[PDB]
Short mmCIF file of C-alpha atoms and ligand atoms in Angstrom, two decimals:
data_model
loop_
_atom_site.label_atom_id
_atom_site.label_comp_id
_atom_site.label_asym_id
_atom_site.label_seq_id
_atom_site.Cartn_x
_atom_site.Cartn_y
_atom_site.Cartn_z
CA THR A 270 0.37 -27.01 11.28
CA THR A 271 -3.21 -26.01 12.16
CA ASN A 272 -4.76 -25.76 15.70
CA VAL A 273 -8.17 -24.92 17.17
CA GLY A 274 -8.33 -21.09 17.34
CA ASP A 275 -6.24 -20.20 14.29
CA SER A 276 -7.46 -17.40 12.12
CA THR A 277 -7.13 -16.77 8.41
CA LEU A 278 -5.93 -13.25 7.32
CA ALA A 279 -9.55 -12.23 6.53
CA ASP A 280 -10.45 -12.98 10.15
CA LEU A 281 -7.33 -11.23 11.44
CA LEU A 282 -8.05 -8.18 9.24
CA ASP A 283 -11.72 -8.06 10.24
CA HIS A 284 -11.50 -7.93 14.04
CA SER A 285 -9.17 -4.93 13.54
CA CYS A 286 -11.05 -1.65 13.92
CA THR A 287 -10.75 0.30 17.15
CA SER A 288 -10.08 3.93 16.07
CA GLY A 289 -6.32 4.36 15.39
CA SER A 290 -5.79 0.61 14.84
CA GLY A 291 -4.77 0.86 11.13
CA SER A 292 -5.50 -0.60 7.75
CA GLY A 293 -3.64 -3.86 8.29
CA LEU A 294 -3.31 -6.62 10.91
CA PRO A 295 -3.06 -5.79 14.60
CA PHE A 296 0.27 -4.08 15.14
CA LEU A 297 1.88 -6.85 17.24
CA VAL A 298 0.56 -9.59 14.92
CA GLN A 299 2.29 -8.03 11.81
CA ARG A 300 5.77 -9.25 12.85
CA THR A 301 4.66 -12.79 13.69
CA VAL A 302 2.84 -13.23 10.43
CA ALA A 303 5.72 -11.52 8.57
CA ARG A 304 8.16 -14.04 9.95
CA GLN A 305 5.91 -17.00 9.17
CA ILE A 306 5.70 -16.24 5.47
CA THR A 307 7.48 -18.49 2.98
CA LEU A 308 8.78 -16.48 -0.02
CA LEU A 309 8.20 -18.40 -3.23
CA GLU A 310 8.82 -16.48 -6.47
CA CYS A 311 9.96 -13.07 -7.64
CA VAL A 312 7.20 -11.38 -9.65
CA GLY A 313 8.54 -7.84 -10.04
CA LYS A 314 11.80 -5.91 -9.86
CA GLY A 315 13.00 -2.33 -10.23
CA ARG A 316 14.84 0.61 -8.71
CA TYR A 317 12.43 0.31 -5.73
CA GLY A 318 13.51 -3.30 -4.95
CA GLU A 319 11.45 -6.45 -5.62
CA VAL A 320 8.01 -7.97 -5.14
CA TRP A 321 7.66 -11.65 -4.26
CA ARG A 322 4.69 -14.01 -4.20
CA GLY A 323 4.75 -15.65 -0.76
CA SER A 324 2.48 -17.83 1.29
CA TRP A 325 1.25 -17.74 4.91
CA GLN A 326 -0.72 -20.72 6.22
CA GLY A 327 -1.93 -21.70 2.77
CA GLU A 328 -2.65 -18.13 1.51
CA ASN A 329 -0.91 -16.04 -1.13
CA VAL A 330 0.65 -12.74 -0.14
CA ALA A 331 2.77 -10.15 -1.97
CA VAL A 332 5.98 -9.17 -0.21
CA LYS A 333 7.71 -5.99 -1.36
CA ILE A 334 11.32 -6.06 -0.18
CA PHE A 335 12.67 -2.52 -0.46
CA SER A 336 16.05 -1.69 -1.88
CA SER A 337 18.27 0.43 0.36
CA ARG A 338 17.93 3.24 -2.17
CA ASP A 339 14.21 3.41 -1.30
CA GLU A 340 13.87 2.95 2.50
CA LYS A 341 11.97 6.25 2.86
CA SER A 342 9.27 4.66 0.72
CA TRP A 343 9.00 1.76 3.15
CA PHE A 344 8.77 4.09 6.10
CA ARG A 345 6.17 6.39 4.50
CA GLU A 346 4.06 3.58 3.06
CA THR A 347 4.08 1.74 6.37
CA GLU A 348 3.35 4.93 8.31
CA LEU A 349 0.39 5.81 6.02
CA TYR A 350 -1.29 2.43 6.28
CA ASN A 351 -0.68 2.10 10.06
CA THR A 352 -1.83 5.65 10.83
CA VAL A 353 -4.88 5.71 8.62
CA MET A 354 -7.76 3.29 8.08
CA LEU A 355 -7.26 2.88 4.31
CA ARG A 356 -9.46 0.04 3.24
CA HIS A 357 -11.04 0.19 -0.19
CA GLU A 358 -11.56 -2.39 -2.91
CA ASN A 359 -9.64 -0.27 -5.49
CA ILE A 360 -6.66 0.45 -3.21
CA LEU A 361 -4.15 -2.32 -2.62
CA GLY A 362 -4.97 -4.08 0.64
CA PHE A 363 -2.17 -3.67 3.18
CA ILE A 364 -1.58 -6.63 5.63
CA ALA A 365 1.66 -6.02 7.57
CA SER A 366 5.05 -4.35 7.62
CA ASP A 367 8.20 -5.72 9.18
CA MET A 368 11.92 -5.21 9.25
CA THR A 369 14.13 -8.30 9.72
CA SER A 370 17.42 -8.49 11.65
CA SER A 371 22.43 -5.81 7.39
CA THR A 372 18.62 -5.25 7.28
CA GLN A 373 15.54 -6.08 5.12
CA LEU A 374 12.40 -3.94 4.96
CA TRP A 375 9.14 -5.73 4.04
CA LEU A 376 5.65 -4.55 3.18
CA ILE A 377 3.16 -7.36 2.88
CA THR A 378 -0.12 -6.96 1.02
CA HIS A 379 -2.85 -8.86 -0.78
CA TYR A 380 -1.45 -10.66 -3.84
CA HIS A 381 -2.95 -9.99 -7.27
CA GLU A 382 -2.04 -12.79 -9.64
CA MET A 383 -3.13 -10.90 -12.80
CA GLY A 384 -0.29 -8.43 -12.19
CA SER A 385 0.12 -4.81 -13.23
CA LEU A 386 -2.10 -2.88 -15.67
CA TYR A 387 1.05 -2.02 -17.57
CA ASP A 388 1.66 -5.72 -18.30
CA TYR A 389 -2.06 -6.44 -18.66
CA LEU A 390 -2.46 -3.99 -21.50
CA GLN A 391 0.45 -5.45 -23.41
CA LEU A 392 -0.94 -8.93 -23.32
CA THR A 393 -4.56 -8.24 -24.16
CA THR A 394 -7.07 -5.99 -25.88
CA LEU A 395 -10.26 -4.70 -24.24
CA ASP A 396 -13.93 -4.24 -25.11
CA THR A 397 -16.28 -1.41 -24.08
CA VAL A 398 -17.37 -3.02 -20.84
CA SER A 399 -13.88 -4.08 -19.68
CA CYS A 400 -12.28 -0.78 -20.60
CA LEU A 401 -14.84 1.20 -18.62
CA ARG A 402 -14.62 -1.17 -15.73
CA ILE A 403 -10.83 -0.65 -15.53
CA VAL A 404 -10.85 3.17 -15.70
CA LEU A 405 -13.90 3.59 -13.43
CA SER A 406 -12.33 1.42 -10.70
CA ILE A 407 -9.12 3.51 -10.85
CA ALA A 408 -11.25 6.64 -10.65
CA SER A 409 -13.06 5.22 -7.61
CA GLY A 410 -9.84 4.24 -5.80
CA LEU A 411 -8.38 7.63 -6.54
CA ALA A 412 -11.51 9.55 -5.48
CA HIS A 413 -11.32 7.60 -2.19
CA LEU A 414 -7.67 8.52 -1.70
CA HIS A 415 -8.47 12.20 -2.35
CA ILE A 416 -11.53 12.52 -0.06
CA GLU A 417 -11.29 13.56 3.57
CA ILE A 418 -13.61 11.54 5.81
CA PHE A 419 -14.24 12.49 9.37
CA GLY A 420 -15.01 10.67 12.57
CA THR A 421 -13.53 7.79 14.53
CA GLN A 422 -13.62 5.64 11.32
CA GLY A 423 -12.01 8.27 9.07
CA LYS A 424 -9.10 9.36 6.96
CA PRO A 425 -7.43 12.52 5.78
CA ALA A 426 -7.15 13.50 2.15
CA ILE A 427 -4.32 11.61 0.44
CA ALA A 428 -2.50 12.45 -2.79
CA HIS A 429 -0.49 9.60 -4.41
CA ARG A 430 2.13 11.47 -6.44
CA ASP A 431 3.35 8.52 -8.56
CA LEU A 432 0.28 7.26 -10.33
CA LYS A 433 1.23 5.20 -13.38
CA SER A 434 0.14 1.95 -15.00
CA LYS A 435 2.99 0.07 -13.32
CA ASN A 436 1.52 1.07 -9.90
CA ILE A 437 -1.94 -0.25 -10.79
CA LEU A 438 -2.77 -3.94 -10.32
CA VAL A 439 -5.51 -5.91 -12.04
CA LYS A 440 -7.93 -7.92 -9.99
CA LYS A 441 -9.51 -11.20 -11.14
CA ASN A 442 -12.92 -9.54 -11.23
CA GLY A 443 -11.42 -7.17 -13.86
CA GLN A 444 -11.38 -4.06 -11.68
CA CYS A 445 -8.03 -2.49 -10.70
CA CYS A 446 -6.46 -1.27 -7.51
CA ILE A 447 -3.96 1.47 -6.95
CA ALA A 448 -0.69 0.47 -5.21
CA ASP A 449 2.52 2.01 -3.97
CA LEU A 450 1.83 4.86 -1.57
CA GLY A 451 5.57 5.34 -0.85
CA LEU A 452 5.41 8.99 -2.03
CA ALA A 453 1.90 9.85 -0.70
CA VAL A 454 1.08 13.06 1.19
CA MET A 455 -1.70 13.44 3.73
CA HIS A 456 -3.68 16.68 4.33
CA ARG A 457 12.61 9.94 -4.74
CA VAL A 458 10.11 12.01 -6.74
CA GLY A 459 7.46 10.98 -9.25
CA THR A 460 8.18 8.93 -12.33
CA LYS A 461 9.32 11.47 -14.92
CA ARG A 462 7.18 10.29 -17.83
CA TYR A 463 4.04 11.02 -15.81
CA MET A 464 5.06 14.33 -14.23
CA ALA A 465 2.65 17.21 -14.63
CA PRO A 466 3.97 20.42 -16.25
CA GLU A 467 3.97 22.22 -12.92
CA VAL A 468 6.31 19.58 -11.46
CA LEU A 469 8.57 19.61 -14.54
CA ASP A 470 8.94 23.46 -14.53
CA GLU A 471 8.80 23.50 -10.69
CA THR A 472 5.95 26.04 -10.46
CA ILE A 473 3.83 23.64 -8.36
CA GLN A 474 2.36 25.51 -5.29
CA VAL A 475 4.09 23.10 -2.86
CA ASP A 476 2.14 24.09 0.30
CA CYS A 477 -1.39 23.76 -1.19
CA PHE A 478 -2.52 20.19 -0.79
CA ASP A 479 -4.76 20.61 -3.87
CA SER A 480 -1.65 21.02 -5.96
CA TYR A 481 -0.77 17.33 -5.31
CA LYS A 482 -4.29 16.11 -6.09
CA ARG A 483 -4.06 17.97 -9.42
CA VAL A 484 -0.72 16.22 -10.07
CA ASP A 485 -2.55 12.93 -9.58
CA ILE A 486 -5.18 14.02 -12.06
CA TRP A 487 -2.66 14.71 -14.84
CA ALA A 488 -1.16 11.25 -14.39
CA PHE A 489 -4.61 9.67 -14.30
CA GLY A 490 -5.35 11.23 -17.70
CA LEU A 491 -2.19 9.65 -19.13
CA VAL A 492 -3.31 6.22 -17.77
CA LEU A 493 -6.79 6.62 -19.38
CA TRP A 494 -5.06 7.27 -22.71
CA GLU A 495 -2.90 4.15 -22.26
CA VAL A 496 -6.01 2.12 -21.53
CA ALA A 497 -8.22 3.61 -24.27
CA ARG A 498 -5.65 2.82 -26.94
CA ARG A 499 -6.35 -0.91 -26.18
CA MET A 500 -10.14 -0.84 -26.54
CA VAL A 501 -11.09 -2.32 -29.89
CA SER A 502 -13.48 -0.41 -32.17
CA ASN A 503 -14.43 -1.76 -35.62
CA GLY A 504 -11.64 -4.27 -35.34
CA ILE A 505 -9.10 -1.53 -34.75
CA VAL A 506 -6.91 -1.02 -31.75
CA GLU A 507 -3.63 0.81 -31.09
CA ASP A 508 -0.49 -1.07 -29.93
CA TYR A 509 0.31 -0.58 -26.26
CA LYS A 510 2.45 2.47 -25.84
CA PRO A 511 3.39 4.54 -22.79
CA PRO A 512 2.61 8.23 -22.78
CA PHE A 513 4.97 10.37 -24.86
CA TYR A 514 6.54 7.27 -26.50
CA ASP A 515 7.12 9.09 -29.80
CA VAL A 516 8.85 12.27 -28.48
CA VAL A 517 10.95 11.13 -25.50
CA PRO A 518 13.40 8.25 -25.15
CA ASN A 519 13.02 5.39 -22.69
CA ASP A 520 13.88 6.40 -19.13
CA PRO A 521 13.39 10.06 -20.13
CA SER A 522 15.31 12.76 -18.31
CA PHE A 523 13.66 15.50 -16.29
CA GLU A 524 14.86 17.83 -19.12
CA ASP A 525 13.46 15.67 -22.00
CA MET A 526 10.06 15.80 -20.33
CA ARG A 527 10.17 19.55 -19.59
CA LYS A 528 10.93 20.37 -23.20
CA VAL A 529 8.07 18.25 -24.53
CA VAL A 530 5.40 19.09 -21.97
CA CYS A 531 6.29 22.68 -20.97
CA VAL A 532 8.36 24.35 -23.64
CA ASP A 533 6.64 22.77 -26.69
CA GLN A 534 3.31 22.27 -24.82
CA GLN A 535 2.79 18.75 -26.15
CA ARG A 536 0.06 16.36 -25.09
CA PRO A 537 -0.61 12.74 -26.07
CA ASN A 538 -2.33 12.55 -29.42
CA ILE A 539 -5.97 11.46 -29.69
CA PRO A 540 -6.47 8.89 -32.48
CA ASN A 541 -9.08 9.97 -35.00
CA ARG A 542 -10.71 6.49 -35.06
CA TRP A 543 -11.86 7.15 -31.46
CA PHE A 544 -14.20 9.86 -32.65
CA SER A 545 -16.39 7.23 -34.33
CA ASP A 546 -17.05 5.37 -31.03
CA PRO A 547 -19.16 7.05 -28.37
CA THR A 548 -17.21 5.72 -25.38
CA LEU A 549 -13.79 6.71 -26.71
CA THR A 550 -15.21 10.10 -27.84
CA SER A 551 -16.22 10.53 -24.16
CA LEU A 552 -12.95 9.23 -22.81
CA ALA A 553 -11.17 11.60 -25.22
CA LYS A 554 -12.95 14.56 -23.70
CA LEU A 555 -12.20 13.29 -20.16
CA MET A 556 -8.44 12.97 -20.91
CA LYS A 557 -8.14 16.48 -22.29
CA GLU A 558 -9.70 17.93 -19.10
CA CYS A 559 -6.95 16.21 -17.08
CA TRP A 560 -4.22 17.92 -19.10
CA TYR A 561 -4.85 21.66 -18.70
CA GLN A 562 -1.62 23.55 -18.01
CA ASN A 563 -3.66 25.51 -15.46
CA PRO A 564 -3.91 22.91 -12.71
CA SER A 565 -7.10 24.60 -11.36
CA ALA A 566 -9.01 23.93 -14.58
CA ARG A 567 -8.56 20.14 -14.30
CA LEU A 568 -11.42 17.79 -13.33
CA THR A 569 -11.52 16.41 -9.80
CA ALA A 570 -11.37 12.66 -9.12
CA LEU A 571 -14.96 12.64 -7.94
CA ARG A 572 -16.11 14.24 -11.22
CA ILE A 573 -14.21 11.72 -13.41
CA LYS A 574 -15.75 8.88 -11.42
CA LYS A 575 -19.13 10.52 -11.91
CA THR A 576 -18.57 11.05 -15.62
CA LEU A 577 -17.31 7.48 -16.17
CA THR A 578 -20.33 6.04 -14.24
CA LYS A 579 -22.66 7.55 -16.85
CA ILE A 580 -20.89 6.17 -19.96
CA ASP A 581 -21.52 2.67 -18.46
CA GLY B 236 16.76 -5.48 28.74
CA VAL B 237 13.33 -6.51 30.05
CA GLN B 238 11.81 -6.17 33.53
CA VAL B 239 9.11 -8.58 34.77
CA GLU B 240 6.64 -7.24 37.32
CA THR B 241 4.23 -9.95 38.45
CA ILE B 242 0.66 -8.67 38.75
CA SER B 243 -0.84 -12.08 39.65
CA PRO B 244 0.71 -15.50 40.13
CA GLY B 245 0.74 -18.36 37.67
CA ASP B 246 1.20 -21.94 38.89
CA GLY B 247 4.88 -21.20 39.56
CA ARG B 248 5.79 -24.49 37.85
CA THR B 249 4.84 -24.63 34.10
CA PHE B 250 7.23 -22.32 32.18
CA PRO B 251 7.18 -22.34 28.31
CA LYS B 252 10.14 -24.03 26.52
CA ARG B 253 11.46 -24.27 22.92
CA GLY B 254 8.76 -25.30 20.45
CA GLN B 255 5.78 -24.47 22.71
CA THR B 256 3.00 -22.17 21.49
CA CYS B 257 2.30 -19.51 24.11
CA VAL B 258 -1.30 -18.26 24.12
CA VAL B 259 -1.46 -14.83 25.73
CA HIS B 260 -3.56 -11.78 26.21
CA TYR B 261 -1.67 -8.54 25.89
CA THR B 262 -1.97 -4.79 26.10
CA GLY B 263 0.93 -2.89 24.66
CA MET B 264 1.68 0.67 25.63
CA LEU B 265 4.27 3.37 25.14
CA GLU B 266 6.48 4.64 28.03
CA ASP B 267 3.91 7.32 28.97
CA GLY B 268 1.06 4.73 29.02
CA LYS B 269 -0.49 5.30 25.53
CA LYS B 270 -2.08 2.08 24.29
CA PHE B 271 -1.04 1.16 20.75
CA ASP B 272 -2.48 -2.40 20.67
CA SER B 273 -4.45 -4.88 22.75
CA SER B 274 -5.72 -8.41 22.05
CA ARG B 275 -8.31 -7.71 24.76
CA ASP B 276 -9.88 -4.95 22.61
CA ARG B 277 -10.78 -7.66 20.12
CA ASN B 278 -11.13 -10.67 22.43
CA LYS B 279 -8.80 -12.82 20.38
CA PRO B 280 -5.83 -14.45 22.17
CA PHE B 281 -2.44 -14.01 20.58
CA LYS B 282 -0.24 -17.07 19.93
CA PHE B 283 3.48 -17.40 19.16
CA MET B 284 6.01 -20.24 19.26
CA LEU B 285 9.01 -19.81 21.48
CA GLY B 286 12.46 -20.01 19.81
CA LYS B 287 11.33 -19.02 16.33
CA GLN B 288 11.94 -15.26 16.75
CA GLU B 289 8.34 -14.52 16.02
CA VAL B 290 8.24 -11.70 18.55
CA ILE B 291 10.47 -8.89 19.76
CA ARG B 292 13.24 -10.12 21.98
CA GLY B 293 11.84 -8.63 25.19
CA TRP B 294 8.60 -10.53 24.79
CA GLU B 295 10.41 -13.76 24.18
CA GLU B 296 12.61 -13.49 27.33
CA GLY B 297 9.87 -11.97 29.44
CA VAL B 298 7.21 -14.55 28.68
CA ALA B 299 9.81 -17.36 29.05
CA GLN B 300 10.11 -16.09 32.66
CA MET B 301 6.39 -16.57 33.27
CA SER B 302 4.44 -19.61 34.36
CA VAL B 303 0.98 -20.57 33.14
CA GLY B 304 -1.86 -18.38 34.49
CA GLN B 305 0.48 -15.54 35.43
CA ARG B 306 -0.19 -11.92 34.64
CA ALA B 307 2.88 -9.68 34.47
CA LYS B 308 3.97 -6.25 33.26
CA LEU B 309 6.86 -6.29 30.80
CA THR B 310 9.02 -3.15 30.58
CA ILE B 311 11.10 -3.65 27.42
CA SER B 312 13.90 -1.35 26.32
CA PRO B 313 14.23 -0.36 22.65
CA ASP B 314 17.18 -2.77 22.00
CA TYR B 315 14.80 -5.59 22.91
CA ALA B 316 11.85 -3.96 21.09
CA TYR B 317 11.62 -2.04 17.77
CA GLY B 318 14.98 -0.27 18.13
CA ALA B 319 16.13 2.89 16.41
CA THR B 320 13.56 2.52 13.67
CA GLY B 321 10.46 1.86 15.68
CA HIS B 322 7.41 0.89 13.72
CA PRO B 323 6.49 3.83 11.51
CA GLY B 324 3.32 5.63 12.50
CA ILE B 325 2.90 3.48 15.63
CA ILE B 326 6.08 2.91 17.64
CA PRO B 327 8.46 5.87 17.64
CA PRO B 328 12.22 5.63 17.43
CA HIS B 329 13.96 4.64 20.62
CA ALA B 330 10.75 3.60 22.42
CA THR B 331 10.61 1.86 25.79
CA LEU B 332 7.47 -0.31 25.80
CA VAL B 333 5.27 -1.64 28.63
CA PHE B 334 3.21 -4.71 27.84
CA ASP B 335 0.59 -6.09 30.14
CA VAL B 336 0.70 -9.86 29.40
CA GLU B 337 -1.29 -12.85 30.68
CA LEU B 338 0.04 -16.38 29.93
CA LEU B 339 -3.28 -18.14 29.39
CA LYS B 340 -2.10 -21.51 28.18
CA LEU B 341 0.67 -23.46 26.38
CA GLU B 342 0.03 -25.60 23.25
C1 TAK C 5 3.29 -3.05 -5.03
C2 TAK C 5 2.70 -4.13 -5.65
C3 TAK C 5 2.38 -5.28 -4.93
C4 TAK C 5 1.74 -6.40 -5.51
C5 TAK C 5 0.70 -7.08 -5.02
N1 TAK C 5 0.39 -8.09 -5.84
N2 TAK C 5 1.15 -8.09 -6.80
C6 TAK C 5 1.24 -8.95 -7.89
C7 TAK C 5 2.22 -8.70 -8.83
C8 TAK C 5 2.40 -9.54 -9.92
C9 TAK C 5 3.23 -9.11 -10.97
C10 TAK C 5 3.45 -9.94 -12.06
C11 TAK C 5 2.88 -11.21 -12.10
O1 TAK C 5 3.15 -11.99 -13.21
C12 TAK C 5 2.89 -13.41 -12.97
C13 TAK C 5 3.67 -14.26 -14.00
N3 TAK C 5 5.13 -13.96 -13.98
C14 TAK C 5 5.72 -14.85 -14.99
C15 TAK C 5 7.24 -14.54 -15.08
C16 TAK C 5 7.88 -14.41 -13.68
C17 TAK C 5 6.97 -14.87 -12.51
C18 TAK C 5 5.54 -14.27 -12.59
C19 TAK C 5 2.07 -11.65 -11.03
C20 TAK C 5 1.85 -10.83 -9.93
C21 TAK C 5 3.10 -7.65 -8.66
N4 TAK C 5 3.03 -6.83 -7.61
C22 TAK C 5 2.08 -7.02 -6.67
C23 TAK C 5 2.68 -5.28 -3.56
C24 TAK C 5 3.29 -4.18 -3.00
N5 TAK C 5 3.57 -3.11 -3.74
#
């Protein structure tokens, strides 16, 4: 029940920047809000645990309740958001983390009722404007993760390491935001389907931060392909498929992927109908420059954002 | 568990009970004095209801031992704070915490 002085989450999130004070609510407030949330309905579930829609004082929140198998993701995700000021409109907005009590680990964030891009693409087709808006916003979120910013207001470079359409949410305004920083590195292993060749054949230069950024870029190219399939041109559109759907089984093994990507050197196929639309011709070219076997040759996140901004 | 060092008296008569909202100002620090949070830095009083487990156990016992107006320094051992786990990237594992707390008002 409401009293004079109460704040909404927007107010609580806003008065929260003294350098070192984190992306979410004030550190002592996180627990109190966590324990005042009513959980309502389960909206996702997987090897990571479950996401619930909850409410706090009349507002929707998402609560991720981690499975015991994936506690290190809770710790790392919570540490990243508490240590760093990571606030961007294309990165999922962190609110609070809490452990209860034989023990539940919670990460509470903004709730996106449209759900994941993965589900979004299965339930709808896209036009030029909405396709570009989706892939640009992902590019922007990812460029922001990758960029080091200095000063009292700043953040280190961050690589994600498990970019996939299931870890992208759709906002009501039709832009997306990247979620799930449980594997992120600052300057469990990735989902196998989206692993870059250097991860699959373990030649990744594991002490060069740029290696991890280039792993993100590979995955980002796969997501573009997923998204571009669903843009209609001349009445034609491809059915939603995940990357490598035709050459690896569901839940592919590390070995299945390595054979396809590294030994046989396969890449997702570019539909020929795309070459008669200028935006998909451009997205086609963007994709291919994310999929060089030489990780150094791949486009940066800032360049993709720049290139996508010009297609318009 | 939790030590209460009075820095300035309250009324010595109005102590919070079950179902009361305590309105406080706080500055939380690590054992060596490093500030990790303060409601004074943002000039927004913090509120919690006693007997709902909304706060770490040390805060709940410690503030229950204070009377309105009182400022006191709470030294809270990890079993009554964030335990083995801490709070990643802010409170380390096995942290003793010192909170400077003023009981402004009950509601
Ligand atoms: C990762 C993701 C999230 C997250 C934030 N918002 N959010 C929203 C969803 C979401 C997923 C699916 C949704 O579908 C809505 C309709 N379905 C219908 C069938 C079952 C109930 C809901 C709605 C919302 C999933 N995850 C999140 C939070 C933390 N980590």
